[PDB]
Amino acid sequence: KKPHRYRPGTVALREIRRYQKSTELLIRKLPFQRLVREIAQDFKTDLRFQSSAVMALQEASEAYLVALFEDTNLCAIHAKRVTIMPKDIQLARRIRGERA
DNA sequence: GCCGCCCTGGAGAATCCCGGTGCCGAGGCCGCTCAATTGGTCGTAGACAGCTCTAGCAACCGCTTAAACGCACGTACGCGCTGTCCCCCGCGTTTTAACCGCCAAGGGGATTACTTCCTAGTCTCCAGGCACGTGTCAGATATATACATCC
Numbered sequence: 001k002k003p004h005r006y007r008p009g010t011v012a013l014r015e016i017r018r019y020q021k022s023t024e025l026l027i028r029k030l031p032f033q034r035l036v037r038e039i040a041q042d043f044k045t046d047l048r049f050q051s052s053a054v055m056a057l058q059e060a061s062e063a064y065l066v067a068l069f070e071d072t073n074l075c076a077i078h079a080k081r082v083t084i085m086p087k088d089i090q091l092a093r094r095i096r097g098e099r100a
Numbered sequence: 101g102c103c104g105c106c107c108t109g110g111a112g113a114a115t116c117c118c119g120g121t122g123c124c125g126a127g128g129c130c131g132c133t134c135a136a137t138t139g140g141t142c143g144t145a146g147a148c149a150g151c152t153c154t155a156g157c158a159a160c161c162g163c164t165t166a167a168a169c170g171c172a173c174g175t176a177c178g179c180g181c182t183g184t185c186c187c188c189c190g191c192g193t194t195t196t197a198a199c200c201g202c203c204a205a206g207g208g209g210a211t212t213a214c215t216t217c218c219t220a221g222t223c224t225c226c227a228g229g230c231a232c233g234t235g236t237c238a239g240a241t242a243t244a245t246a247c248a249t250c251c
Contacts, residue, residue: 002191002192005190005191006189006190006191007190008188008189008190009189011189011190012189028197028198029199030198030199048207048208048209083188
């Protein structure tokens with residue numbers, strides 16, 4: 001219960017300016033390893049993983065999600081909005097050719 | 101005469117600066133060592149020349165006709181404004197699991213060296229499949245001619 005609450009949006013701009021400067025991975029390593037192993041046991045059983053393989057998968061997945069979020073933000077801005085919605089992701093993936 | 105209180109001076113300890121010496125990152129030097137270099141030989145890939153036949157190109161023609169263009173009207177939709185409500189954001193508090201540091205043994209896989217043998221490259225010879233051209237043949241199409249019929 002303290003005064004001087006911040007306006008909704010300048011904190012998000014601060015995290016935008018912070019996370020666009022830094023280069024570290026934004027997803028924790030152990031949940032991503034568990035997700036990769038859970039996906040990979042469907043294709044083949046008794047699969048071992050190098051740590052650099054999981055790191056390459058994490059780098060590629062984070063780059064893909066960041067680029068998709070940039071296209072999604074462009075979709076949301078084009079619809080005279082500032083909030084991203086699942087239809088923006090759907091339109092971005094449709095124009096990209098993933099849903100086409 | 102005896103005892104208590106205020107003012108001022110020089111010596112002991114803390115700190116800054118400089119010199120001698122030991123440790124981390126990087127570069128010169130040395131040793132192995134394997135792949136780039138050099139030299140020679142030879143086969144053939146490609147450059148060059150030559151002839152033949154077909155497509156493209158610049159600039160013009162003529163004719164047709166459907167597409168393009170201009171204009172007027174009208175109305176549907178993009179856009180701006182306002183309300184509203186709801187849902188996402190900011191923040192405080194509590195939980196929880198990521199992260200790092202640990203076993204405990206065992207298998208997977210990357211190398212180094214070695215052996216062996218099966219299979220694919222290479223060469224020679226041959227023949228049949230593919231590409232092209234043509235004679236022939238059965239299905240599809242159009243009309244010639246004869247019969248039943250309405251006015």
